[PDB]
Amino acid sequence: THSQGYRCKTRYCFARKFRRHGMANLTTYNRVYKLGQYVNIKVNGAYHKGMPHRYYNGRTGTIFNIGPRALGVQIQKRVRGRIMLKRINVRLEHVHPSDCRKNHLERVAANDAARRLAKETGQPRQNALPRAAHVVSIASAIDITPLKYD
Amino acid sequence: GRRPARCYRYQKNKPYPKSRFCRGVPDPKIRYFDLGNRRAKVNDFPYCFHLLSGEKEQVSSEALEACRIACNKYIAKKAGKDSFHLRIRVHPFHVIRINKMLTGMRGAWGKPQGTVARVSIGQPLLSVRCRASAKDYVKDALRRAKFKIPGRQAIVESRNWGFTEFTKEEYEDLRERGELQYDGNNAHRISRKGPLN
Amino acid sequence: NPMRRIRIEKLVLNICIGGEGDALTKAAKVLQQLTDQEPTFSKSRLTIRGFGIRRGQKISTHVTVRGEKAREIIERGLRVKNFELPYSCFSTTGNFGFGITEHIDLGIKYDPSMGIYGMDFYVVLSRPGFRVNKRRAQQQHVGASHKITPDEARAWVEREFEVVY
Amino acid sequence: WVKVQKTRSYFKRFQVQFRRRREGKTDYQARKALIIQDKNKYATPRYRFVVRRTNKDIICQVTAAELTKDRVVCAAYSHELPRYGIPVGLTNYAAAYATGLLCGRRLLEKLSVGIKENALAQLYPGLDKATGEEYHPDENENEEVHAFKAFLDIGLARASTGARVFAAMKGAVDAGLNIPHSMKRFPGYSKDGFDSSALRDRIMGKHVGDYMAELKAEDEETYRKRFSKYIAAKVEPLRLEAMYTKAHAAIRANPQAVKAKFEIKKPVRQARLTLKERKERIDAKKLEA
Amino acid sequence: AKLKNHTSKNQNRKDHRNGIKKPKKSAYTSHKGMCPKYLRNLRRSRANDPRQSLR
RNA sequence: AGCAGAGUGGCGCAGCGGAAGCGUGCUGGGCCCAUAACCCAGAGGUCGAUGGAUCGAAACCAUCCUCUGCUACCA
RNA sequence: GCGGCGCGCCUGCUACACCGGACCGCAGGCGUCCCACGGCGGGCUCAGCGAGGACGGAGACCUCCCGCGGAGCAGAAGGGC
RNA sequence: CGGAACGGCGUCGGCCGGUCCCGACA
RNA sequence: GCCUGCCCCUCGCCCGCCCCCCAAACUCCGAAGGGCCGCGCCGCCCCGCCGCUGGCCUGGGCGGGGCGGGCGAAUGCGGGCG
RNA sequence: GUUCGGCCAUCCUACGGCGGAAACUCCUUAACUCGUUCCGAAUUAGGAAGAGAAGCGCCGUCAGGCCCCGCCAGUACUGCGAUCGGAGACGUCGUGGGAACACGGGGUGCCGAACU
């Protein structure tokens, strides 16, 4: 790589997809961001001012500070032996709030709902676990066989 | 001329067609990829014969020219020129390059010296459509072509009528239904989508 | 329908003098004298040695006259052409154009120092309902049912300017 | 013959522009700038002032733009002005300044709907007279409650000197809603020394009054055709100025919203064809031909 | 006379010997780089009632 | 070969945007009994092909064509 | 040695979908040019296809239509609009 | 019993066909 | 076939519909495989501060109590720091 | 139905039909305010003589485009092992992932604030 400029090998990542070419929905600007929210970083080619680098595209981080115009996000880059927390300042047009732990947040409400149900009444993540028994009707049996090469 | 062609045979370098970047390519030898009755009709020539690659080699354009002439001459003598339509289905786009023998490996990017065509297995390198007169002659005519192409190749009678995708049984069935149509050398299954008049 | 009426939208008189400098200025006055409206010059998009042209050279002068002032000028000009036009002259969109040689025949004094000035009269036609393709809001194009047709225009001119085809 | 520019390809690549922009009603670049709030402000609402003029009615609404929709706090239209005195010229320059008085006083009253001590409306009466005095509602000490800050929307209308939309904003500022502005695009600003009288004249339509005289001198017949409702209703050239001072006054006293009745005259709603109806139609043109 | 130009063989293994060392906890909660309005407010806001460390 | 120059009236050469000139050749009109010199004239060049560019390119720059100008030796 | 300059930089690629990846590997640029080719606001739509208009055609300019950008954005290339 | 494009009536094992009590001019 | 021609037949163009093959520096789409983040202390209910914010009885941060509930992927292992 | 929105073609484009009380537009005029390389064309001011012709709304296209789902196909490709064969090119086998175009069928915007 004789050429390693800031925007290098960003022919495909930075570019918009098929018809998305255009301004950003005003939702990008309207969304309210809280300190410590887990936010993904996804660069948009149109807004050249304030773009996250090609490494930072795809990554998911936390917002260190909410500033006027630019969100500041802290993302971990594994440089050789150590992982380093790099704080960067991204424009609001290239960050997208990330569900991320929406699963955990959904589950804690669900666990609390079950705990609540246990107080109200309730008298009496498993990875797969065995199929158990079961009995299947074999009368619809299609005997299949290999087919000759032709 | 030069290079016994063993050097340029099994597919090795990434495809290098003559775009803006690759220039200076000397003109490919094979130019006539359509021969005989290119102006024929779909119903005629219902027997189709194909030469099919059994290797992943790169058959040279000069080699492709020889195979075209060997097949065209034999069918023409044995049966009428208008009893077959010959299609060289591989086109010689890939460009082969030579490090001139006249320094050495320092600066070895090669000037282009040739044009070659990459043929995967199951690709019909050559195909022919013949009327019953040459239904016999074409099979051995294509063997006399097979030798010029390197590697092992098989002569297989297509069970599809002519060059049409449909099988001979289907082409007659679509024709008898009237669903069939003519596009000069080809037919279409239904043509039933679009605004009704 | 009263709202399906045809009206003339505008008439443009264009004089391409051809790199003569003051002559295009005299023709700026000519268009002003015949229309009581200031002219606008033009600049070259392409520069050509054969045509005596350089990029930005002033070659044309054109005023767009819209209204009774314009309608009168079309008919003064057509009298020069003897109220007769080609059937082909009508454009597909629904506008026509003719050209006159000599500003004098229109009914303008030929002071002879001012040059005889050939002009070209193009007449765009509109209908009530056409402020949909020039408005900043809702600029949606006019529907084909309302749009003028070459055939409609030929008859409207027959039922008005009374010209032979 | 002629190639078809609209290929099945041109159609595939086409990105429809945003719904509102494809209709033409919203300038997205401008409103993106207007809805911008520093992220430090977080979820505090930013209030926009919208003034769009229709063919016969100047429409004003104060709105805040949420993530899922737009939420108008309160709105006033020129249709309401006959209730407060003016039945003709519903789109005139004087109606605009008056609609914005309704727009500003309807809101100042609703913000003060529950305060009951020193309220939003109670703190800021606004200019009792109608005048171009460069009135600014936030130049005062304020503190605790301060003037609601809205931002004027000219929409797709050019910000012309003397524009009707501009009168509406002066009407809102005169009520007391602090809409930031400079008195340069209002009539009578001649570099330094704003002519308050020219704005006072326009907001108390005297310009229409002079035109009424021009027609009453040149040709009475045109003046019946060009001023039919003005002749039909008893709106004299002289009386309109008295009417305007009452119209401004009526608004200040009770500006609350009263709803006219709504009859939903929904249309025929011809139904879409069924697949069998669609297939029979194919059959008819298979039968005829 | 021509030495190898570049290799990354056995670079990832070398890093993994004591690799994936997370960047401390001070960095995670550090006030470095934050808005000089957020922090200036925080320091004054903190100096009230139980949080105040004023003498 | 690499690397560096050169392509223009028929010929030999000039030519920096924007002029394509000279000398001769050539085709006339005289001057001489004629032919030369001589005088009065005219016409001469896709500025080597393919491009590109400023927005008009011998020129500016590549790519080819076509020639020319000089070049490890030594184990 | 000579010829080069991956001897400071950049775009597309080899690079094998995070990032990283070598070569006197490829196809190429830079060392400048702009008080406007700058900032900002307002207004506008471009290249064209077809069609029409004294001179007027392979092109002069004026009009229409339909125009997802086929224009333009100093200069390499990729983006972006 | 390094090796190929190719040949082979060496010897086994398949496949696609047919002719064959009508016996594969009689 | 025609003062000549505009009296026209056949091909090249243009345009449509097919069709043979393709592209490191083409892309409608688009895998494998990888990268980044999460997987425990949640809610309710008040209170204190702030020059930071704002029409406000506003947000938001940083704290103090109470009232609730807990341990809520598999497997293996003590980690961290100079 | 209007104004403002949200996501941004199931919403688009082209061609028919059908409509309006109100609404929207079209429309009518330039005394002014402003406004056009010239032109009230746009635009700005002032209106109400007209109007469904248009825009717009609802329906129609063996309509294109678009979205959905089938089929393509366990195919192409590739992850992981193989003393798997093969002279190689490549291809198999166990253990895992799985396209795409075509082609077939169906559809063809909905969501909130203020209003009336």
From TrEMBL, chain A:
One of its GO terms (cellular component) is cytosolic large ribosomal subunit. Keywords: Ribonucleoprotein, Ribosomal protein. GO terms for biological process: translation. Pfam families: Ribosomal_L21e. It comes from the Eukaryota. SUPFAM superfamilies: Translation proteins SH3-like domain (SSF50104). GO terms for molecular function: structural constituent of ribosome. Belongs to the eukaryotic ribosomal protein eL21 family. PANTHER family: 60S RIBOSOMAL PROTEIN L21. This is Ribosomal protein L21.
UniProtKB/TrEMBL annotation, chain B:
Keywords: Metal-binding, Ribonucleoprotein, Ribosomal protein. PROSITE patterns: RIBOSOMAL_L10E. The keyword Metal-binding applies. Gene3D superfamilies: Ribosomal protein L10e/L16. Mg(2+) binds at residue 13. CDD domains: Ribosomal_L16_L10e (cd01433). Signal peptide: none annotated. InterPro entries: Ribosomal_uL16, Ribosomal_uL16_CS_euk_arc, Ribosomal_uL16_dom, Ribosomal_uL16_euk_arch, Ribosomal_uL16_sf. One of its GO terms (molecular function) is structural constituent of ribosome. One of its GO terms (biological process) is translation. One of its GO terms (cellular component) is cytosolic large ribosomal subunit. Belongs to the universal ribosomal protein uL16 family. This is Ribosomal protein L10. It comes from Giardia intestinalis (strain ATCC 50803 / WB clone C6). The lineage of its organism: Eukaryota, Metamonada, Diplomonadida, Hexamitidae, Giardiinae.
TrEMBL record, chain C:
One of its GO terms (molecular function) is structural constituent of ribosome. GO terms for biological process: translation. The keyword Aminoacyl-tRNA synthetase does not apply. It comes from the Eukaryota. It holds the Pfam family Ribosomal_L5. The keyword Ribonucleoprotein applies. Gene3D superfamilies: 3.30.1440.10. Keywords: Ribonucleoprotein, Ribosomal protein. One of its GO terms (cellular component) is cytosolic large ribosomal subunit. InterPro entries: Ribosomal_uL5, Ribosomal_uL5_C, Ribosomal_uL5_dom_sf, Ribosomal_uL5_euk/arc-type, Ribosomal_uL5_N. Belongs to the universal ribosomal protein uL5 family. This is Ribosomal protein L11. It comes from Giardia intestinalis (strain ATCC 50803 / WB clone C6) (Giardia lamblia).
UniProtKB/TrEMBL annotation, chain E:
Residues 1-55 are annotated as: Disordered. GO terms for cellular component: cytosolic large ribosomal subunit. Keywords: Metal-binding, Ribonucleoprotein, Ribosomal protein. The keyword Ribonucleoprotein applies. Residues 14-25 have a biased composition (Basic residues). It comes from the Eukaryota. Mg(2+) binds at residue 19. Pfam families: Ribosomal_L29e. One of its GO terms (biological process) is cytoplasmic translation. GO terms for molecular function: structural constituent of ribosome. InterPro entries: Ribosomal_eL29. The keyword Aminoacyl-tRNA synthetase does not apply. Belongs to the eukaryotic ribosomal protein eL29 family. This is 60S ribosomal protein L29. The lineage of its organism: Eukaryota, Metamonada, Diplomonadida, Hexamitidae, Giardiinae.
